[PDB]
Design a binder for this molecule. Sequence first.
Ligand code: BCL
Ligand code: BCL
Ligand code: BCL
Ligand code: BCL
Ligand SMILES: CC[C@H]1c2cc3[nH]c4c(c3C)C(=O)[C@H](C(=O)OC)c4c3nc(cc4[nH]c(cc(n2)[C@@H]1C)c(C(C)=O)c4C)[C@@H](C)[C@@H]3CCC(=O)OC/C=C(\C)CCC[C@H](C)CCC[C@H](C)CCCC(C)C
Ligand SMILES: CC[C@H]1c2cc3[nH]c4c(c3C)C(=O)[C@H](C(=O)OC)c4c3nc(cc4[nH]c(cc(n2)[C@@H]1C)c(C(C)=O)c4C)[C@@H](C)[C@@H]3CCC(=O)OC/C=C(\C)CCC[C@H](C)CCC[C@H](C)CCCC(C)C
Ligand SMILES: COC(C)(C)C/C=C/C(C)=C/C=C/C(C)=C/C=C/C(C)=C/C=C\C=C(C)\C=C\C=C(/C)CC/C=C(\C)CCC=C(C)C
Ligand SMILES: COC1=C(OC)C(=O)C(C/C=C(/C)CCC=C(C)C)=C(C)C1=O
Ligand SMILES: CCCCCCCCCCCC[N+](C)(C)[O-]
Ligand SMILES: CCCCCCCCCCCC[N+](C)(C)[O-]
Ligand SMILES: CCCCCCCCCCCC[N+](C)(C)[O-]
Ligand SMILES: CCCCCCCCCCCC[N+](C)(C)[O-]
Ligand SMILES: CCCCCCCCCCCC[N+](C)(C)[O-]
Ligand SMILES: CCCCCCCCCCCC[N+](C)(C)[O-]
Ligand SMILES: CCCCCCCCCCCC[N+](C)(C)[O-]
Ligand SMILES: [Fe+3]
Lengths: 302, 281, 240
Amino acid sequence: AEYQNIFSQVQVRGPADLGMTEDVNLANRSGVGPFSTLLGWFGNAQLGPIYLGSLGVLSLFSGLMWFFTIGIWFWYQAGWNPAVFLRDLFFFSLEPPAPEYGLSFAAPLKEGGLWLIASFFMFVAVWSWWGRTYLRAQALGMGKHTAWAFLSAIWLWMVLGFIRPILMGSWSEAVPYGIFSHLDWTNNFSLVHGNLFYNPFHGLSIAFLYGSALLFAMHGATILAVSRFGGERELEQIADRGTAAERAALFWRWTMGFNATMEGIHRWAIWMAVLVTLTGGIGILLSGTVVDNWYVWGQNHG
Amino acid sequence: ALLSFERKYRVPGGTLVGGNLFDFWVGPFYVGFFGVATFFFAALGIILIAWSAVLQGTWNPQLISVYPPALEYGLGGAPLAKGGLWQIITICATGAFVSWALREVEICRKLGIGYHIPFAFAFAILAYLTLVLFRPVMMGAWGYAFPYGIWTHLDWVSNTGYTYGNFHYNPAHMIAISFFFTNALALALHGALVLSAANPEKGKEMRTPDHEDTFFRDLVGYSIGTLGIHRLGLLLSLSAVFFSALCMIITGTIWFDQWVDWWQWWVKLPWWANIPGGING
Amino acid sequence: DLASLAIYSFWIFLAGLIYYLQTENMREGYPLENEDGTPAANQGPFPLPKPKTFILPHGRGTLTVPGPESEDRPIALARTAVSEGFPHAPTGDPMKDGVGPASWVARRDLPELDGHGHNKIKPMKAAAGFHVSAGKNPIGLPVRGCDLEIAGKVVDIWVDIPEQMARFLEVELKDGSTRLLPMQMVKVQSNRVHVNALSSDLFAGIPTIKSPTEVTLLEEDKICGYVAGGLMYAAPKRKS
Ligand code: BCL
Ligand code: BCL
Ligand code: BCL
Ligand code: BCL
Ligand SMILES: CC[C@H]1c2cc3[nH]c4c(c3C)C(=O)[C@H](C(=O)OC)c4c3nc(cc4[nH]c(cc(n2)[C@@H]1C)c(C(C)=O)c4C)[C@@H](C)[C@@H]3CCC(=O)OC/C=C(\C)CCC[C@H](C)CCC[C@H](C)CCCC(C)C
Ligand SMILES: CC[C@H]1c2cc3[nH]c4c(c3C)C(=O)[C@H](C(=O)OC)c4c3nc(cc4[nH]c(cc(n2)[C@@H]1C)c(C(C)=O)c4C)[C@@H](C)[C@@H]3CCC(=O)OC/C=C(\C)CCC[C@H](C)CCC[C@H](C)CCCC(C)C
Ligand SMILES: COC(C)(C)C/C=C/C(C)=C/C=C/C(C)=C/C=C/C(C)=C/C=C\C=C(C)\C=C\C=C(/C)CC/C=C(\C)CCC=C(C)C
Ligand SMILES: COC1=C(OC)C(=O)C(C/C=C(/C)CCC=C(C)C)=C(C)C1=O
Ligand SMILES: CCCCCCCCCCCC[N+](C)(C)[O-]
Ligand SMILES: CCCCCCCCCCCC[N+](C)(C)[O-]
Ligand SMILES: CCCCCCCCCCCC[N+](C)(C)[O-]
Ligand SMILES: CCCCCCCCCCCC[N+](C)(C)[O-]
Ligand SMILES: CCCCCCCCCCCC[N+](C)(C)[O-]
Ligand SMILES: CCCCCCCCCCCC[N+](C)(C)[O-]
Ligand SMILES: CCCCCCCCCCCC[N+](C)(C)[O-]
Ligand SMILES: [Fe+3]
């Protein structure tokens, strides 16, 4: 049996790594968290620091407020009884206003008002978090790829809770906050739109979701297979190609007749991933606004 | 026909079967004994599909479909026009996939690299086999297997799922899904992070892995590191598939009722089953 | 209808994206070559992209790709057939010559640097104050090769500073000099470090480093290529 590099055999530690400075406002960085030997078998042992800042605080406060608003409603649905809370945890649901209120903010707290407030908090939490992925790259002089990628996830999210409801004319079209209910919503959405398997953008979204796992399995396995030549030091392989990057490319050229580079694999990666939610958001956004029934649409192609 | 750096690696050796007999390339493609096996299996398989198409009476790719034996045939043979072709195509598919994995192993050995790739691929093969072989066998008929057709295979997924109600309630399926979504999330971030470092703001120098750790600690208070992320993408994607296979192998065998009802075990726990209020009282 | 328009558009977009992606991934290794090193007649349907330039940190320069490709080293292999597509036999000792699974690339003969401009990899003794934090400490253990003979003993671990990981074991041989062994190619056991890639007589042949407290990207490639090459090339001296 040979060593496979899934878990490390020996961990080493040195002074807490406080990170690169560049243009980062250092006043806004925490101290270092603890060191987890458990984590260190698989990844880095070090926790923190983290960056705080004004946007950070806003996003976290907002995110908590979203979480607590749903949880308060849940406790209420449980009649304040801890045992019923845990029993029925996956069954509770904070639901959007009924169709009759349309897009108005005029529904009672118990019948949708609270849904809108939780949604409001979720909206400022996510967008200020988006702001943070741009700003943390900026302060480090880095490209904006993370924020561009995040924006694609945000797109499916915005379509589900915000843009599709607005275009349909009511908040009742949006997704409820609950474990089992969000699933029922999903199954129902497909039933009511003539089976999402007939939506070409749903099938594309699947090709990409499956493609992501295919590609991450390929890439992750390839890098590990060449880690004995320093393959995971990808930035320096980009700047100065080594025998790791060459054995990697040739594995694939010889197998399937074409190959990537150390930099370009990362572009196949980012795109395979973002296209899950890009095509997904489009398929949902079209559902009910333009196409009532995918099976029907599919019979006419147009 | 060769990459500029390619020649020094095209030495003899690494084969599992046949010594030097198949130790060669065709254009970029390595051959090997398992390249020959793959060609043979794939070729037969494709020919059999084209024959199954004639017996179905269509050539449109959106309509060709090769269905397994109906349930009454059990685990036995079937006339070719009525399930036999599926059965032979399935042996061909299996032979092709396994040959492809073993050819990948020959390529690893010639290249002096780890075996992680064919090992990973073997998970996908195990998933295919769960659906076409393991599950049908445990259930007692080939006809529970999915058919080979573009849309018909989707009909099978829909019909199979709704046999158990909303298939979302399969708990192994919930875990599988979570690994799929988490995998895509991590793929996005890995691609973006490497590229943000390699392609910094205009005029700046390439960032370092130190910047990559920094960015992710700044953002969420942790960074798994450059070895860790590749360990992670691999674990997430193999776990997603392990749980996919699991979620199906347990369906129609140990659990065959409506998956939503499985969850009653928690609600019916004696401590709280009978307290009024909430959703289930 | 708008859905028809969106789907048709998407497929056009996707063809464009795949074209972009495949050409990005042609920044290294192209143009394709015949086995003799001259440009191949058939380059395929994707053309080379416009060059881009990476600015390297710490005065190391730039990299522009695609650019002229050359091995920048002698390749001790010769044809075994009269036509394209067959293996090339080593003309000497492929481990010493650095071909096949023993290959190395003519990377820069400088050390990789961290974000502060210091050597990324250092012996732990010179890395303040890094130490083993978990697992069996390999330092002091005998090193055994695939011939089941002792080749030497571990005298240090070389560590990646910014990423806090073990990268090599430094092993001292019978003559008092040392070699680097990639961490990925050894098995730390309770009483020994086991190296399946190399029999013990091949340890002396491991490429040496020029300065005792740093290792260059070129030296890493030669060391790692050589050790991996033992899998194929030390197989006669291994050993169930
Ligand atoms: C895509 C179409 C559907 C949908 C279809 C499904 C299906 C089908 C499944 C899920 C599943 C999940 N979905 Mg959903 N899901 C939708 C939109 C979302 C959105 C959103 C838009 O904001 C959220 C937060 C969730 C979150 C959830 C998680 C509860 C769960 C695992 C997600 C994951 O691995 O993420 C990636 C991992 C992360 C890093 C973050 C996720 C962490 C989770 C735990 C936090 C999310 C909610 C949180 C408040 C729950 C805490 C539980 C207790 C109350 C303490 N879904 C839309 C409406 N989702 C799976 C499940 O297990 O459901 C029970 C599942 O089988
Ligand atoms: C995995 C769980 C389910 C199932 C669930 C679904 C669902 C749901 C969907 C698909 C969809 C797809 N499935 Mg399916 N699928 C199943 C098993 C398979 C198997 C198999 C095990 O052999 C195959 C080859 C396919 C392949 C297909 C593709 C036609 C299509 C896009 C897949 C993709 O990009 O994947 C990711 C991998 C890559 C990106 C690599 C590319 C490889 C693809 C393009 C291979 C195509 C093969 C096909 C045209 C013909 C193969 C036989 C030839 C004679 C050689 N499915 C099982 C039964 N599949 C989607 C679709 O639109 O169908 C209409 C879709 O919505
Ligand atoms: C009965 C169910 C229906 C069906 C109904 C739906 C519906 C409805 C939808 C999908 C969607 C999808 N379906 Mg479908 N689905 C069907 C069958 C399948 C099958 C199958 C049969 O094998 C598969 C593989 C899939 C696969 C997929 C995905 C390709 C796609 C969602 C991608 C995604 O990453 O979303 C997950 C990612 C997100 C939801 C974005 C996350 C948003 C960000 C901003 C997160 C915020 C989180 C934060 C605030 C919470 C913090 C908590 C943390 C702990 C901190 N479906 C059947 C036919 N499917 C989605 C789609 O795009 O369709 C086209 C969708 O809306
Ligand atoms: C109405 C339908 C039901 C449904 C019922 C089912 C059923 C039924 C199944 C799933 C399964 C899946 N479902 Mg579901 N499920 C639904 C809702 C969803 C939703 C959602 C958001 O609503 C999601 C995300 C999912 C997600 C999941 C995945 C966990 C899983 C599919 C991936 C997989 O098995 O890969 C595994 C990968 C493979 C099988 C591919 C292997 C192929 C390799 C070996 C070779 C191919 C090579 C060749 C032919 C290529 C051609 C060569 C060319 C040159 C390219 N389901 C609804 C509720 N679901 C499936 C599963 O787990 O299967 C095990 C399954 O059978
Ligand atoms: C491209 C498609 C894929 C994708 C990509 C993606 N997601 C993204 C981004 C990108 C590239 C990131 O940049 C961003 C990120 O920062 O990731 C680390 C993110 C992200 N995607 C996330 C989740 C997520 N993404 C989804 C998946 C996907 N994202 C797609 C598959 C899903 C699914 C599948 O449903 C989930 C649930 C987050 C981890 C992160 C966005 C974080 C965010 O918007 O935060 C807003 C709210 C908060 C700031 C906190 C919320 C409150 C919590 C409920 C409280 C619990 C914890 C609390 C923080 C503790 C506080 C304690 C202190 C008081 C001490
Ligand atoms: C385990 C994690 C994920 C994964 C990993 C994975 N896949 C792998 C590998 C790995 C690491 C590769 O090494 C290997 C590869 O070479 O990739 C480029 C591969 C591979 N994954 C592939 C496909 C694939 N993987 C899939 C999924 C996954 N692969 C998992 C999500 C899927 C999905 C999700 O549906 C598909 C379609 C191929 C691109 C490739 C293997 C190619 C191969 O085996 O070639 C040899 C055989 C042929 C050339 C054709 C055989 C023809 C048959 C005899 C007839 C066809 C019968 C078929 C059953 C009918 C299907 C009809 C459909 C409409 C259903
Ligand atoms: C222990 O108890 C306490 C209370 C302490 C803590 C426990 C709390 C609990 C149990 C919380 C549980 C939370 C759960 C289960 C939440 C799950 C949510 C899920 C599954 C979400 C899934 C889908 C969400 C979507 C798609 C929502 C999208 C939202 C938007 C796009 C926002 C749109 C904004 C709107 C409508 C407001 C408009 C306002 C303006 C003017 C912008
Ligand atoms: C851009 O690459 C990535 C890393 O960044 C350098 C990570 O760090 C992580 C985070 C991974 C883990 C294991 C979270 C759990 C850790 C704790 C705090 C228990 C992901 C997903 C990732 O994509
Ligand atoms: C998310 C990371 C948490 C995973 C922790 C798993 C720890 C595995 C430890 C195995 C150690 C193996 N060995 C023999 C070297 O000790
Ligand atoms: C998704 C991963 C979340 C990990 C959060 C890690 C938090 C780091 C805590 C740092 C606190 C250090 N301290 C006490 C000195 O301020
Ligand atoms: C990063 C690009 C990779 C491209 C992979 C695209 C696979 C196409 C699968 C066809 C999906 C068919 N349909 C009708 C559902 O759209
Ligand atoms: C989406 C699947 C389409 C099948 C095509 C597979 C792409 C392989 C391209 C490599 C071609 C090899 N070569 C150099 C002979 O052209
Ligand atoms: C509340 C769901 C949170 C998302 C994380 C993964 C979802 C799986 C939840 C089901 C747990 C499965 N099981 C068997 C332990 O109950
Ligand atoms: C960050 C990697 C961990 C995966 C998190 C995604 C939620 C899936 C639930 C994990 C459950 C896995 N397991 C085996 C403990 O049940
Ligand atoms: C999922 C994306 C599918 C497209 C992959 C097929 C692209 C093949 C590129 C082959 C080109 C190889 N070549 C001749 C440039 O060396
Ligand atoms: Fe990578």
